[PDB]
């Protein structure tokens, strides 16, 4: 896991922060000119979770396509559980 | 705390992908289109946290400005140190 907070300096976290923001405005920007909508319609794979020991699961990786008219993407939206919220990779 | 992934099925799993998935497409690509710019640039407001028992934050709230040449917006992001995560509210 990360740091704790308090291990976190307020310039630690700005940096943080920043990458993040300017990550994303980047990311999901680019998503949306290259499908060529905010609203893609989305496809669903298959979900592969543990059939056993499955209370020690922390993560559900849902997998999707989502298509627009100018084209379709790839994702893997990692759910975590307990925290509720996704983080996607591709 | 959210629910254990072990108590979430597919059906619930992909509901809360999708709809944060595409909120998340909405959100960013309207500030980057009010913005006007993918590579805004960040001012940065004072951060308050906590002077006493630090080792119970969770989140740092770091608050920001980001800049473009179409406009200006607001931003909170909640910075969750250990899981390395940030959410963005206004």
Redesign the interface.
Same mark, same amino acid.
């Not at 896991?1 to 976190?8: D, R, S, T």
């Not at 699961?57 to 559900?60: G, V």
């Given at each position: 896991?990360?740091?704790?907070?308090?291990?976190?300096s307020?310039e630690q976290?700005?940096t =943080?922060?920043?990458n993040?923001?300017?990550q994303?405005?980047?990311? /999901?920007?680019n998503? !949306?000119q290259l499908l060529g909508t905010?609203?893609?319609k989305?496809t /669903?794979e298959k979900?592969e979770?543990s059939l056993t020991d499955?209370?020690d699961?922390?993560?559900?990786l849902?997998p =999707?396509k989502?298509e627009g008219p100018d084209g379709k993407r790839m994702?893997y939206?990692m759910?975590?559980? &307990? &925290?509720?919220? !996704? &983080?996607?990779a591709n």
């Open positions: 896991k990360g740091p704790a907070c308090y291990q976190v307020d976290a700005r =943080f922060v920043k993040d923001y300017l994303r405005m980047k990311r /999901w920007d998503d !949306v905010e609203i893609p989305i /669903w979900i979770r499955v209370e699961e922390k993560t559900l849902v =999707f989502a994702y939206g759910y975590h559980c &307990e &925290e509720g919220y !996704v &983080e996607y």
